[PDB]
């Protein structure tokens, strides 16, 4: 970076170069890459944070529920081949959002919570 040796208790090593805590910054926004995430992105000769990397080079997808696009930086729920906007990952019956460890069934592209599988299938199929 500043091309000067640090002389402190803690320093960083990235892209076969040594850096300060303050010197290893994202080339686009200037955020401290060490405090923000344990990894940096290296594209077109630039050291980039995840956000700027994904906004610029990320791959978008299609939501299995709403059929609208999902931008690369959007939070998602991956289930087998399918991908959902986090807000679309909800039970088709009760419209309830889930918790880690909860049980749901995947029918086609429908997410139906466990409690609801019976009544939903009874009504819909």
């Amino acid at each position: 970076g500043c091309q000067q040796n640090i002389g402190d208790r803690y320093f960083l090593k990235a892209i076969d170069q040594y850096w300060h805590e303050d010197c290893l910054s994202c080339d686009l926004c200037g955020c401290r890459l060490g405090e923000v995430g344990r990894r940096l992105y290296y594209k077109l000769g630039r050291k980039l944070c995840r956000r700027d990397y994904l906004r610029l080079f990320g791959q978008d997808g299609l939501c299995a529920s709403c059929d609208k696009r999902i931008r690369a930086y959007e939070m998602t729920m991956r289930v087998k081949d399918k991908v959902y906007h986090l807000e679309c990952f909800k039970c088709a019956a009760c419209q309830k959002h889930f918790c880690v460890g909860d049980r749901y069934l995947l029918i086609n592209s429908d997410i139906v919570c466990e409690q609801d599988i019976y009544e939903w299938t009874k009504i819909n199929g």
Binding site: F11, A14, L40, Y41, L54, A72, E74, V100
Partner: peptide, 29 residues
Amino acid sequence: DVMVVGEPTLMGGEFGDEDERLITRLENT
């Protein structure tokens, strides 16, 4: 066919593995 809810993940986060570089924190004296 009955599944368990996992953690969310970012959309393009699967795709940018090649471009990911690791930051090593080191010690002195």
